[PDB]
With several copies, the nearest count.
Chain A
Amino acid sequence: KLRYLNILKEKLGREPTFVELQAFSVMWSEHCGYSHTKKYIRRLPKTGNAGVVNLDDYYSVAFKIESHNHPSAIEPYNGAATGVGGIIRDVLAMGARPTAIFDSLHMSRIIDGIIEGIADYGNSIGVPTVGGELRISSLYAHNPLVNVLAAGVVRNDMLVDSKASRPGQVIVIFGGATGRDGTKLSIQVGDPFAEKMLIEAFLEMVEEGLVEGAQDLGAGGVLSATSELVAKGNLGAIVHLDRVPLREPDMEPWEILISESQERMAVVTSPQKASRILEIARKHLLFGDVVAEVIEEPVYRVMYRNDLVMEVPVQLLANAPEEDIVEYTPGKIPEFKRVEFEEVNAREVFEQYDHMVGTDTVVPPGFGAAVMRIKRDGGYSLVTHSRADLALQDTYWGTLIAVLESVRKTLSVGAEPLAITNCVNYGDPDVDPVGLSAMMTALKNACEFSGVPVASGNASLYNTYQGKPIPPTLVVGMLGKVNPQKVAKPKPSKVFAVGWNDFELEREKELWRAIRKLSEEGAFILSSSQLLTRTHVETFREYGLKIEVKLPEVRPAHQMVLVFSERTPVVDVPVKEIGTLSR
């Protein structure tokens, strides 16, 4: 809103009021506006709901990843904690029970603050933290990244929309109290207890069949929730702010609208089914009332009882000014030198997280990918990967190998890929709109090569200190279909290094179809950047196993995995015997 002001004045035909100036300074920001990414995001192949993937025609898994790097910069604990909160709700809005969370951390040292953040929150809501990243390097020192990925399971005959379908409907706001939360007006503590009461409250409203549409209240709050609920429906809404559950009754109308208070949710239902929805909230210790009315005219009316404060067209809010793309075309696969990333033990970080709650975790973290189940059905496998060390030398091939090496880790357990979830953590997009394109086109092409679509995404730009940008890191989140019985559990066997030391895309699909011919055969595969990490040897010791091998030194960009079978692997790719895994 430093230059986008002049573009707003010509669409309104006058000067904006104090209510409108604060509304569009948050709605047309780079967080919930997407000005430098909206046009690239349409070019990427998607999967009529954005965030859900069909698994068994009976069930469907809902997953998304958000980036809370900015509130984690000022305060680590209450930042990462706040992060798990806003992503858990974006999954619950689809009517799914949050079944798995991931934490993609990128710091200078294992900051006890960010770690304890995801812990005290994730464990308090009974959602297992079944894995995550821990890329430690002094390049992130003054700019840490925290990408939390929440996942949930849901029946297809109980799925919830994310838009208001017809007029004559009402939007109900419930959850925690709505106060003054938006080094002063930006720091807030999360209430993981209210979040659990919000989950069990919402999921009873779903089974009661009273949810016809819903949206989370994270960034922007009541404004960015009720406006985006009628913007994807092409309809409108009349918002009464006197009906919003206030904590401090002495709040001015604009503060009730722009309030970015947590633990709140938005539900679209009919006025006859609202008397039963508020009784479910009061039963779960939550506060709620009817705030908005869905009309036919595509306008957004905001008033406070009888007097008005703001009225602007609905589509002028959800659609931010789309910047122009600078299409990038691919260059030669460079010779990558090894960028030293401190090799740490992930056990010390996840043994602080409840990764077994729900009793649905089949494969606990340590050996990359994590496999889950649905207690009856079938299961799903999620992995989180980002080749940050390669992305530094090449903004394209580094980011492309990240999407491919992700699919490599998903086939290692025995799961056939279904979807991807992106998260762009670029530096300044105006000083270098060239590097952002090399990344977005690296994710577009890598999704056409593997034929794996993108369900949902995110982008947190402007990450700089001293003016110097952050290493372009794209975090991929895979999802795959698997049978919880046909999973690789570490047995005492001989270790084989399969694949080749060098990288060449021209024969990458030959490694994938080589891993597949080895998984349904009953072997344990391990795909990692450094082949075997400190983490792998420590998770092996917990299974009472010791590993002694001669790891063939590979180049940073490689196509190799370690296979632990009984007899010599029968595949059409280099198979060398490197050791054993006794006792």
Chain B
Amino acid sequence: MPLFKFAIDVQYRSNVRDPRGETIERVLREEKGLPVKKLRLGKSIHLEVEAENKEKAYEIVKKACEELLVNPVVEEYEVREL
């Protein structure tokens, strides 16, 4: 029964407005003054999985994303290992 650590990076589409993030860009340039343009905000989900191999383990993560974790309407995701 082997474990496979994963980390899903979820973000809003590169053309879907995120004013929660434009508000963060406002502050830490005008109130904290750092040269940091172009900032998006999203979710970061870490999850360990039990399976036979690594290719069948990635299948569980990819399932969980389609039918719960990620909203296929305005969110895009990219998964990596840990």
Q: Does B63 make an interface contact (CB < 8 A)?
A: no
* B64, chain A: closest CB distance, angstroms: 17
Cβ of A187: which chain B residues have Cβ within 8 Å of it? 16, 73-74
Contact of B17 with A75 in the complex, beta carbons under 8 Å = no
- Cα of A247 to Cα of B25 in the assembled complex, Å: 14
Contact of A183 with B73 in the complex, beta carbons under 8 Å = yes
Q: Does A434 make an interface contact (CB < 8 A)?
A: no
Q: Which A148-185 residues have a C-beta within 8 angstroms of B?
A: 179-180, 183-184
Contact of B19 with A193 in the complex, beta carbons under 8 Å = yes
Contact of A180 with B16 in the complex, beta carbons under 8 Å = no
* A221, chain B: closest CB distance, angstroms: 16
Contact of A247 with B17 in the complex, beta carbons under 8 Å = yes
- Contact pattern, B 3-35, Cβ under 8 Å of A = 1, otherwise 0: 000000000100111110001000000000000
* A68, chain B: closest CB distance, angstroms: 16
**Contacting B17 at CB < 8 Å: which of A74, A179, A183, A184?**
A179
Q: Does A191 make an interface contact (CB < 8 A)?
A: yes
Q: Does A194 make an interface contact (CB < 8 A)?
A: yes
Contact of B73 with A189 in the complex, beta carbons under 8 Å = no
- Cα of A200 to Cα of B4 in the assembled complex, Å: 39
- The dominant DSSP class at the B interface is loop
Q: Which A172-231 residues have a C-beta within 8 angstroms of B?
A: 179-180, 183-184, 187-191, 193-194
Q: Give the residue among B15, B16, B19 with the most A Cβ atoms within 10 A.
A: B19
Q: Which B23-71 residues have a C-beta within 8 angstroms of A?
A: 23, 71
**Contacting B73 at CB < 8 Å: which of A74, A180, A194?**
A74
- Cα of A191 to Cα of B24 in the assembled complex, Å: 13
Q: Does A259 make an interface contact (CB < 8 A)?
A: no
Contact of B23 with A193 in the complex, beta carbons under 8 Å = yes
Contact A189 to B19, CB < 8 A, known contacts A75-B73, A78-B74, A183-B73: yes
- The dominant DSSP class at the A interface is loop
- Cα of A184 to Cα of B16 in the assembled complex, Å: 9
* B72, chain A: closest CB distance, angstroms: 10
Contact of B74 with A189 in the complex, beta carbons under 8 Å = yes
- Which residue of B is nearest A181, CB measured? B17
- Which residue of B is nearest A184, CB measured? B15
Q: Give the residue among B16, B17, B18, B74 with the most A Cβ atoms within 10 A.
A: B17
Contact of B19 with A194 in the complex, beta carbons under 8 Å = yes
* B27, chain A: closest CB distance, angstroms: 11
* A336, chain B: closest CB distance, angstroms: 37
Cβ of B74: which chain A residues have Cβ within 8 Å of it? 75, 78, 187, 189
Cβ of A190: which chain B residues have Cβ within 8 Å of it? 19
- Cα of A74 to Cα of B73 in the assembled complex, Å: 8
Cβ of A179: which chain B residues have Cβ within 8 Å of it? 17
Q: Which A38-75 residues have a C-beta within 8 angstroms of B?
A: 74-75
- Cα of A187 to Cα of B12 in the assembled complex, Å: 12
Contact of B15 with A189 in the complex, beta carbons under 8 Å = no
Contact A189 to B18, CB < 8 A, known contacts A75-B74, A78-B74, A183-B73: yes
Cβ of B15: which chain A residues have Cβ within 8 Å of it? 180, 184
* A449, chain B: closest CB distance, angstroms: 45
Cβ of A193: which chain B residues have Cβ within 8 Å of it? 19, 23
* B13, chain A: closest CB distance, angstroms: 9
* A79, chain B: closest CB distance, angstroms: 10
- Which residue of B is nearest A247, CB measured? B17
- Cα of A188 to Cα of B16 in the assembled complex, Å: 7
Contact of A189 with B23 in the complex, beta carbons under 8 Å = no
Cβ of A184: which chain B residues have Cβ within 8 Å of it? 15
Can you spell out 14 A-B residue pairs with CB atoms less than 8 angstroms apart?
A75-B73, A78-B74, A179-B17, A183-B73, A187-B73, A187-B74, A188-B17, A189-B12, A189-B18, A189-B19, A191-B19, A191-B23, A193-B19, A194-B19
Given known contacts A183-B73, A247-B17, what 15 new A-B pairs fall within 8 Å (CB)?
A75-B71, A75-B74, A179-B17, A180-B15, A187-B16, A187-B73, A187-B74, A188-B16, A188-B17, A189-B12, A189-B19, A189-B74, A191-B19, A191-B23, A194-B19
Residues of A within 8 A of B (CB): 74-75, 78, 179-180, 183-184, 187-191, 193-194, 247
6 tightest A-B contacts by CB?
Answer: A191-B19, A75-B73, A187-B74, A187-B73, A189-B19, A187-B16
